[PDB]
Design a protein around this ligand. Structure first.
Ligand code: HEM
Ligand code: KE2
Length: 394
């Protein structure tokens, strides 16, 4: 007697389990059990992942409904699962998306300056260096303080909420509410602070006092700050960290991008495609009976969209484990999702990684792991896959 297949399969972010390819071939939608004990449908082919993400009857909002089968416990108030919907309904979607592009004057230069300063400090201190805690995550934090218009010195405290906020837990987490309420209070004070005039929070502060927004709640304005800081920092920091591993393990690619930095955008797009930073499939709740492959998913059931199932599918990306800079379909991966909930920070996330890699390859052309790859410690029961430390020499 066996048990129902459990998800997630592995917290290791340096390699995909051989098991994913076997599953995609044999059963590209199949029943699994999540850490809560709920049953769910795990979808692992490119075609069926795209189908689910482009059909809004598979709803992200309804995953928050009381009594639903759950992937994990909520770490935000349930109305925040509808965050982008709430922003759109408030008439704020265009302004929010405009504030988080990489295109504001001076933003790219600030990113380069910050990355170079972090790297110079590591070089001064001498190898080994930890590229997660002392490069990728501080670069992500600095970027999001600048994008939000808030003081750089406020970044570390906001950052330290995230090791709990993005937990993937069977049960509610008391610390998550403590930190959430504190971080909301912080952002509410930012909106009242006359010195905050730039970035996303400076723009929201003006719109809040504009008559066209007089009935938008103060709670939503503060929530936009907390959520875009948290999603952006955890996503860019975790992605850059595991991209650095993929790059360091490919010395030929490392040297090519060092020699020809104009290929860095194509390289980052492939690093996005093969990235294992998302620890769980993306969750959706069926709001109707819907045919997905050989399975009739029933109303009220949970569906999990496995991004690396799609992104390593050889029917869409031949030789899927190979980084190839000349693919005919290079941005067609699902690293930023697809459909209604496509990542609103995709351009900024690309530029964060491109600039971080450019700066690293120039400052540390001989970068290499300082420990055997199996010695990395992979964070468990978390919404991202990340090594607790990333020790390198150069
Ligand atoms: C490389 C970096 C990033 C990656 C890999 C990434 C990935 C994703 C993915 C896969 C989704 C879809 C989730 C779903 O459909 O369930 C998403 C949504 C989102 N991302 Fe990103 N993201 C990144 C950077 C950022 C940045 C920089 C921000 C903000 C500054 C951000 C904010 C968000 C938000 C707010 C959503 C939810 C959108 C919605 O529900 O409609 N992300 N991201
Ligand atoms: C835990 C946490 C999540 C967020 C993002 C915020 N929460 C949501 O549930 C929905 C959907 C979602 C999107 C991306 C993601 O990675 C997880 C969920 N949309 C949002 O914008 C922000 C701060 C947090 O502490």
């Amino acid at each position: 007697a066996t048990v129902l297949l459990e998800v997630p399969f592995s917290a290791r972010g340096d390699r995909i389990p051989d098991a994913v390819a076997e599953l995609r071939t044999r059963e590209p939608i199949r029943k699994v059990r999540t850490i809560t004990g709920a049953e769910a449908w795990l979808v692992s082919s490119y075609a069926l992942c795209t189908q689910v993400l482009e059909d809004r009857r598979f709803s992200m909002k309804e995953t928050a409904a009381a009594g639903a089968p759950r992937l994990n416990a909520l770490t935000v108030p349930p109305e925040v699962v509808n965050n982008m919907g709430n922003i759109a309904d408030a008439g704020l979607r265009k302004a929010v998306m405009k504030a988080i592009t990489p295109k504001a004057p001076g933003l790219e230069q600030f990113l380069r300056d910050t990355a170079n300063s972090l790297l110079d400090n590591l070089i001064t201190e001498g190898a080994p260096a930890d590229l997660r805690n002392d490069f990728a995550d501080p670069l992500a934090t600095a970027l999001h303080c600048k994008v939000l218009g808030i003081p750089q010195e406020d970044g570390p405290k906001l950052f330290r909420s995230l090791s709990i906020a993005f937990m993937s837990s069977a049960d509610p987490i008391p610390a998550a509410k403590i930190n959430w309420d504190r971080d909301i209070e912080y952002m509410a004070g930012i909106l009242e602070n006359p010195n905050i005039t730039t970035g996303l929070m400076g723009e929201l502060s003006r719109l809040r006092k504009d008559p066209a927004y007089s009935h938008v709640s103060d709670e939503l304005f503060a929530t936009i700050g907390v959520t875009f800081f948290g999603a952006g920092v955890i996503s860019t920091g975790s992605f850059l960290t595991t991209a650095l591993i993929s790059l360091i393990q490919r010395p030929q690619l490392r040297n090519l991008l060092h020699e020809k930095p104009e290929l860095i955008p194509a390289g980052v797009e492939e690093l996005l495609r093969i990235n294992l930073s998302f620890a769980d499939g993306l969750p959706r709740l069926a709001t109707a009976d819907i045919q997905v492959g050989d399975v009739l998913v029933r109303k009220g059931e949970l569906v999990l969209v496995l991004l690396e199932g799609a992104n390593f599918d050889p029917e869409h990306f031949p030789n899927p484990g190979s980084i190839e800079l000349d693919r005919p379909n290079p941005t067609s991966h699902l690293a930023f999702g697809r459909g209604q909930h496509f990542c609103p920070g995709s351009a900024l996330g690309r530029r964060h990684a491109q600039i971080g890699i450019e700066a690293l390859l120039k400052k540390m052309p001989g970068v290499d792991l300082a420990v055997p790859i199996d010695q990395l410690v992979w964070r468990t029961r978390f919404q991202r896959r990340i090594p607790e430390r990333l020790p390198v020499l150069w």
